[PDB]
Amino acid sequence: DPEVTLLLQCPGGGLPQEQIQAELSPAHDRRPLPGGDEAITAIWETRLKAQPWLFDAPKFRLHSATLAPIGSRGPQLLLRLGLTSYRDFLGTNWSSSAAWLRQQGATDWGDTQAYLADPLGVGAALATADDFLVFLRRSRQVAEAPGLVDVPGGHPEPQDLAGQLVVHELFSSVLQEICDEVNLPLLTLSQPLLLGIARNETSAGRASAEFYVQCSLTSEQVRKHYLSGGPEAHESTGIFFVETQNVRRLPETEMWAELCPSAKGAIILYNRVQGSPTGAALGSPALLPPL
Ligand SMILES: O=C(c1ccc2snnc2c1)N1CCOCC1
């Protein structure tokens, strides 16, 4: 799967909010382009002169994420974050020249991402009370990954002593994206666990935080809530469900070729961190079938 790379696999079945620190610093921002940020401005101007209803928005930038030694007490993860924007994304990661910016970053800074916006996404492996994961079909008319399968999520917009508010907004935003797109009540959702971070190599290495969220409703009830919004209540064109039993072998199915890279990230991390039992009971051959 060359279109997805794992940057972080979380320990202990995934990390709760209270075990994560963030450092939000201009030291973690994109570097100005070698010939100046005028190239980003020119692309934006061309875009607005064709689609003048478009608007810019701020985004978090992932610089890096450092895990503590396993088995330790105290904070278990440090997220190094800067700030970027939708405009900077359109002029760098989404640019036809994105691979040239990666080579220049290697040359100038020893960092393939130095000249990339790299806005941080969020996504969820969302499980039902009857043990299914939730999938969404993307419109065939959108610019990114048309007609492919996705999981719930988005790209959160800003607003340890400003850090804890930032971690709070990241955990909040994955629940908000589930309530807005799937139309579920907030009180049917668990507190999220962070499974890990996955990079989209088809979009020049931009990264998504991937979470595990449990719903107290069954697959049939989740479908009812999704549909009862009507076609205007969601960006996706349909919802469907796969037994957690069958998610284990999903990369061997015809569905895999239809998953967008960030949804592949969410399913690989679910299989590694929530699947793959470590103990004698769940590891027994009748509960963990060979092959
Ligand atoms: O939701 C998104 C979107 C896509 C990529 C990124 S990367 N940073 N934030 C993003 C936001 N879009 C694009 C514009 O039209 C509506 C759908």
UniProtKB/Swiss-Prot annotation:
UniProt keyword Phosphoprotein present: no
Enzyme class: hydrolase
Domain of life: Eukaryota
Cofactor: Mg(2+)
Region annotation (Disordered) ranges: 147-159
Amino acids binding Mg(2+): 177, 181
InterPro entries for this protein: NUDIX_hydrolase_dom, NUDT22/NUDT9-like
Coiled coil: none
Catalytic activity: UDP-sugar + H2O = UMP + alpha-D-aldose 1-phosphate
Ranges where the Nudix hydrolase domain occurs: 117-273
EC number: 3.6.1.45
The keyword Metal-binding is annotated on this UniProt entry: yes
Similarity comment: family membership: Belongs to the Nudix hydrolase family.
Function: Hydrolyzes UDP-glucose to glucose 1-phosphate and UMP and UDP-galactose to galactose 1-phosphate and UMP. Preferred substrate is UDP-glucose.
Name under which the protein is recorded: Uridine diphosphate glucose pyrophosphatase NUDT22
Gene: NUDT22
